Amino acid sequence: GSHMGLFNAHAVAQQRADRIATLLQSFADGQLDTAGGEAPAPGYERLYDSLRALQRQLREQRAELQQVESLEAGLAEMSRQHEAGWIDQTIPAERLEGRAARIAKGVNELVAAHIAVKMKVVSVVTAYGQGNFEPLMDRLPGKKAQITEAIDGVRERLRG
Amino acid sequence: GSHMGLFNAHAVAQQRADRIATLLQSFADGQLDTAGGEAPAPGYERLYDSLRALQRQLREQRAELQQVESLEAGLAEMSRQHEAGWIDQTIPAERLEGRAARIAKGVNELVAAHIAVKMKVVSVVTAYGQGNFEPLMDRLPGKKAQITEAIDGVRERLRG
Ligand SMILES: [Cl-]
Ligand SMILES: [Cl-]
């Protein structure tokens, strides 16, 4: 409450500000591990609340970007496997979660559809390759129509 | 420098703390638009530096999660298009960037490979469907080997 009082106040305010600066710094440097601890006094309660709120967020967002890194990893893996013909490989969707998992599942099902059209073609053409000319290629939509009529083309030939 | 001085110091420190709390709050609520402005005094310079550093980060991370939202969008679109047979559709990789763009390109090329094996099959089977038995299905790796030998199967039949 004198001059020494005012100086001391500032010395303290300065320090409070300093640890807060340290926390925000270990937040920019991905160290969301250390909780800020208790506020030093009433005047900083809200700030510290926002500090935790900011931590909880910086955390989630980090997890999500991570997932996305696993996704690009598994996709890469799946691509490698498929070029080599190991077409039963898929991005391990289970290991992922959230947005990343959805994307992963989308990719697997998208390829699955394409692969299915081949399993059929490979089939009703295997039969055609050994006499049986009974089966027909499934009617396919849009530009996949070709496949359906190219298999029908070879069906006429063999027939007769 | 008296009692009124100490009180005033605290009134100020309290306020400084308050705006800082407001900034960190509009950072948790995705409002990374407002720069903190200048520090109120030396003791808060570093803290404000970390405040900007934290803003620049919260920004980037938001952009990335966004990209990932476009990605899941385009993938969805591509899936819709393909089920309907519009197999020339692709995730618009250009509109994206960073990790998301890479993933998008991966997905497009992964499907492209699968589609290519079909373009060939549809071809060397169209020929087989109209007399020509000269062309051969390309030797394929792993489990795609089937396709290559199922087309060879029907090649023998037609031949002779
Ligand atoms: Cl291999
Ligand atoms: Cl349509």
Numbering used by the authors:
A (entry chain A), B (entry chain A): -2 to 157
Q: What's in the article?
A:
Crystals of L44H and V33G proteins were obtained in the context of Aer2 1–172 using conditions similar to those of the native protein. V33G crystallized in the same space group as WT, but L44H produced a different crystal lattice. However, the increased flexibility of the connector and loss of the V33 side chain for packing into the bundle core should affect the ability of HR2 to stabilize the HAMP2 structure, and thus we expected this substitution to disfavor conversion to a HAMP2-like conformer. Compared to H1, H1 V33G had increased CW bias in CheRB+ cells and was also CW locked in CheRB− cells. Temporal assays confirmed an inverse Asp response by H1 V33G, in that Asp caused a drastic switch from 16% to 100% CW bias. The mechanism underlying H1 V33G inverted signaling is not completely understood; however, it is clear that a branched hydrophobic residue at HR2 is important to achieve the HAMP2 conformation and CCW signaling state. Stabilization of a HAMP1 state by V33G is evident by the effect of this mutation in the CheRB− background, where it produces an exclusively CW state.
HAMP domains are small modules, approximately 50 amino acids, that dimerize to form an entirely parallel four-helix bundle with two helices (AS1 and AS2) supplied from each subunit. The three N-terminal HAMP domains of Aer2 (named HAMP1, HAMP2, and HAMP3 from N- to C-terminus) provide examples of two distinctly different conformations: HAMP1 and HAMP3 are similar to the Af1503 NMR structure, whereas HAMP2 has a comparatively distorted four-helix bundle structure in which the AS2 helices approximate a two-helix coiled coil and the AS1 helices splay outward at the C-terminal end.
